[PDB]
Curated annotation (Swiss-Prot):
Reaction it catalyzes: L-lysyl-[protein] + S-adenosyl-L-methionine = N(6)-methyl-L-lysyl-[protein] + S-adenosyl-L-homocysteine + H(+)
Keywords on record: Methyltransferase, S-adenosyl-L-methionine, Transferase
Subunit-structure text: Monomer.
Chain span(s) of sequence motif DxGxGxG SAM-binding motif: 34-40
Lineage of producing organism: Archaea, Thermoproteota, Thermoprotei, Sulfolobales, Sulfolobaceae
Family note: Belongs to the class I-like SAM-binding methyltransferase superfamily.
Organism: Saccharolobus islandicus (strain REY15A) (Sulfolobus islandicus)
Record's note on what induces expression: Seems to be expressed at similar protein levels when grown at 75 or 85 degrees Celsius, or in the exponential or the stationary phase.
Catalytic temperature dependence: Optimum temperature is about 60 degrees Celsius. Is active over a wide temperature range, from 25 to 90 degrees Celsius. Has half-lives of about 30 and 10 minutes at 80 and 90 degrees Celsius, respectively.
Function as written in the Swiss-Prot or TrEMBL entry: Catalyzes the methylation of lysine residues in target proteins, using S-adenosyl-L-methionine (SAM) as the methyl donor. Exhibits broad substrate specificity, being able to methylate the crenarchaeal chromatin protein Cren7 primarily at 'Lys-11', 'Lys-16' and 'Lys-31', as well as a number of recombinant Sulfolobus proteins in vitro. Methylates lysine residues in a rather sequence-independent manner.
Record GO biological process: methylation
Pfam annotation, one family: Methyltransf_31
Name assigned to this protein: Protein-lysine N-methyltransferase
Length: 162
């Protein structure tokens, strides 16, 4: 009666997201801008626990568009968590002090140097498991749970290469 459907997508444990917030040093006075929401679990755990100042999820979908809205009410984190639809190009994240990335796309544009112009220096950027080429991370650690492992890279705007 459960898990009957063909091997469906399984989101990573909230623990993974939790580590991403800790390293980013997200404080109640710091906002969180993430484009990997896909349900708001990324920003909801922030406002819900980290009491972030302002949490916003960037994404555009149809069926999943209503899911994220629902997840906000479920955790009663309205006002602190929101979803913005459109093209990342159209919107701006320069106002964001803390940002994270989590995409399942194997190959896509990174636009690393763009961040140096969009995001002000001192901004915190966290990548999923794929490290940023050309850039030097500030803190890199791994997490093991069961028989799996995850790696998270933290970067800081203002200084790259070395």
């Amino acid at each position: 009666m459960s898990y009957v459907p063909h091997v469906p997508y399984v989101p990573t444990p909230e623990k993974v997201v939790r580590r991403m917030l800790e390293i980013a040093k997200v404080s109640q006075d710091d906002i969180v801008y993430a484009l990997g929401c896909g349900d708001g679990r990324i920003i909801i755990t922030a406002a819900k626990d980290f009491n972030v100042k302002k949490a916003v999820g960037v994404e555009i979908n149809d069926e999943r568009i209503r899911e994220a809205l629902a997840n906000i009410e479920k955790n009663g984190v309205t006002g602190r968590a929101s979803i913005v639809k459109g093209n990342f190009f159209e919107v701006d994240i320069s106002e964001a002090t803390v940002v994270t990335m989590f995409l399942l796309t194997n190959v896509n544009e990174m636009l690393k140097p763009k961040l140096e112009k969009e995001l002000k220096p001192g901004t915190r950027v966290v990548s999923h498991e794929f490290e940023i080429r050309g850039w030097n991370p500030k803190e890199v650690i791994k997490v093991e749970d069961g028989n799996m492992n995850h790696t998270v890279y933290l970067y800081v705007i203002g200084e790259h290469k070395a």
